[PDB]
Every structure is written in structure tokens, then in C-alpha cells.
Amino acid sequence: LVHVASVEKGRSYEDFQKVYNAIALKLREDDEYDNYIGYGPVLVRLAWHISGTWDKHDNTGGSYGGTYRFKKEFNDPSNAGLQNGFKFLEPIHKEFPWISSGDLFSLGGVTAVQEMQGPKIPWRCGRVDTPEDTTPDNGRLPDADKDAGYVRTFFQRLNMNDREVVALMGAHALGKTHLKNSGYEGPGGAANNVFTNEFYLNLLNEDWKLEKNDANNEQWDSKSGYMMLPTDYSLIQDPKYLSIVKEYANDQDKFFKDFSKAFEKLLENGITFPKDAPSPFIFKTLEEQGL
Ligand code: HEM
């Protein structure tokens, strides 16, 4: 099963920078969402969830086809809450109807990371919408109530190794769990809408207690008022993950570089880029543009 990237007709870097900017300006404008966390974190989660359906074995799922727009995937229990990110992006799609759905969802995540002061994430265009019957079944996204061996095995399906897994998980410094969406409640950190390596520092430095939340699920809670999922905490229970947690806790630049690589890879899994495709784009932030 082959998905060849096809550049939206006649478009180039400037066109996609305009879409970036519109997303970034709306992120700035719609500041109140989720008790003033804003839409950055949910856009990052949306980009991951539309990518994380991928299966390396048969190239089903993945970001290419933009299939989140169809009811089966939209209504996946694993995707509860992401409707907010979709609704956010709706007016952007209306303004730029030429961009594919998978390009828009993935670019939303890139824009959020960068506007939250994260690393630059190179991004490639050319995902093409595919029909409703290409939508992957529910159940391809990961469970939170599991251990390190689960996490490691899960991510093999997305062709991610230990370092890539631990780097990607650093996104859990962003935003929060919401009891109504996932059966977990609380923020992972103090800087909910700024991208840093706080996830790793908090895992190592906080005093975590294994408690039950109001949905009768176990989660790790700190006296500082933070939480970790069982799968997050597994990164300090497994010796191989722990070494990499310590590395990123002690080197902000290394985390940023490794995250950027793993996140681009996640967003591009399943896609074949022609040898004469454009190079990946690196978008300027609003701040860099004086906007
Ligand atoms: C073992 C893997 C993972 C599990 C089990 C998992 C699970 C969860 C759960 C249960 C939530 C809360 C959803 C809600 O209640 O609103 C969540 C939030 C989120 N996840 Fe993950 N996740 C995993 C990996 C990732 C990865 C790879 C990324 C992206 C690089 C990511 C990004 C986020 C973001 C940013 C949030 C916050 C969303 C918000 O504030 O609205 N997750 N995740």
C-alpha cells in the first residue's frame, strides 16, 4: 500500500507559511480555551492521534489520508476531546480550502509546538485526502493503564525505538488530562502551554503517589498538584527508559532536537516522498516575523 506525496497544485513555502500564520494567530486569539491553556496542546494531541493510527506492517492508517474527518475515526473513544482541535481548525480550512486534511491536521501540531516555544519541526506537504473506506478501525491508539513493556511493544508498530518513544512522551508536559475525555484528571506540569523538558524533570524530581481518581482509575499524583499516567511513570520504572529520561532532564537542547526528529517522523510515517519533492519547510514563528 503506497501513498505518494502530491504537492497541492502550484503551492510553495509561502502558501504554507500563510496557513501556519493563520493557525498561530488564532492560537493567540482564542486564549481562553481550557481555563486559559489555549488550543496548543490539543492541536499537538490531534496531530499525534491522526498519525498514531499507522501500522508499519501494511501501511494502513497514518496522517496521509486525513481520515479523522470521517465519523468512525472522529468518534473513536481514544479521540475524545479532539473535536475541540478539529473545530479550531475548521475556519482555517475554510480560508484555505486547497490544503489537504492530513496536511492541515499535521501542520496544526507543528504550529502549536513552535508557537509554544518548542523546537522547529521541519514539515512536508503533499498528504492527499482518501475516501471514507480507508479510515482505520478504532483501537490503534495506546492505552494509558499499562506498563513499560506495553509501551515499548506498542510503539514498534509505529517504527519507534526507545529514544524516540521517550522523546515523544515529553509532549505530556503540555495541557492536561480531562476526566470526561479519558478517565484521568490533572496537568502534568506547571507550564501547561510552554514546550520545555519539564516532563522529565517532574518525573525525576517530584514526589509521586499512586492514587485513584474520581473515575476509579489509578494515576500518579504529586503534592505539587501534577499527575502522570501509568504509562508515563513506566518511563522511570524501566531501566532503559530511565536512562533516557535522565538524559533529557539534563539537556534541553538534546530533547528539543530528538523530539523534532521523532515528531516529524511520526507525522510522515506511511508517506512516500518523490525524489524531486520539495525539501521540508521550516516555518518562521509569528515572533520571528514580527507579527
Ligand atoms: C503511551 C502513549 C500515550 C498515551 C497512553 C497517551 C495518553 C494520553 C491521555 C490519556 C491524555 C489525556 C486526554 C484527555 O483527557 O483529554 C493525553 C493527552 C495528551 N497527549 Fe498523550 N498519550 C500518549 C502519547 C502521546 C504522544 C506521543 C504525544 C505527542 C507527541 C502526546 C500528546 C498529548 C498531548 C499534548 C496531550 C494534552 C492534550 C490536552 O491538553 O488537551 N501523547 N494523552
Class in CATH terms, 142-262:
mainly alpha
- Mutation to probe ligand 1, out of 30, 43, 48 (largest number of atoms < 8 A from CB): 48
What angle separates helix 40-51 from helix 83-95, to the nearest 10 degrees?
A: 90
Distance CA 74, CA 83 (A): 7
- Indicate which atom in ligand 1 lies nearest the CA of residue 184: 15
Cell of 184: 484521568
Measure the CA–CA gap between 251 and 178, rounded to whole angstroms.
30
| Atom 40 of ligand 1, residue of closest alpha carbon | 175
Give the mutation target among 177, 220, 268 for probing the ligand 1 site: most ligand atoms within 8 A of CB.
Answer: 177
- Among residues 120, 136, 11, which one has the least CA distance to residue 63? 136
- How was this structure determined? It was done by X-ray
Closest CA to 65 of 108, 106, 114: 106
Residue nearest to atom 19 of ligand 1 (CA): 45
Per DSSP, 210 falls in state: E
Residues 6+ apart with CB under 8 A from 125: 5, 7, 8, 11, 16, 103, 278, 281
Do the Cβ atoms of 119 and 113 come closer than 8 Å? yes
Residue with cell 519507534: 160
- The C-alpha cell at 222 is 504529586
Q: Give the nearest ligand 1 atom to 143 CA.
A: 5
Report how many helices (DSSP H) and strands (DSSP E) the chain contains, helices first.
Answer: 14, 7
Query: Cα dist. 136→42, 103, 251 in Å?
Result: 21, 18, 37
Domain 1-141+263-291 in CATH 3.30.530.80? The answer is: no
Strand-pairing partners, residue 220, are: 210, 228
CA atoms of 111 and 25, how far apart (whole Å): 10
Segment 236-245 long-range contacts (CB within 8 Å, at least 24 positions apart): 236/203, 236/204, 237/147, 237/148, 238/148, 238/149, 238/152, 240/162, 241/148, 241/162, 241/165, 241/166, 244/162, 244/163, 244/166, 244/167, 245/166, 245/200, 245/203, 245/204
Domain ranges for the chain = 1-141+263-291, 142-262
What distance in Å separates the CA atoms of residue 241 and residue 88, rounded to the nearest whole number?
35
Instruction: Report the DSSP pairing between strands 176-177 and 186-187.
Output: antiparallel
Protein residue with least CA distance to atom 18, ligand 1: 177
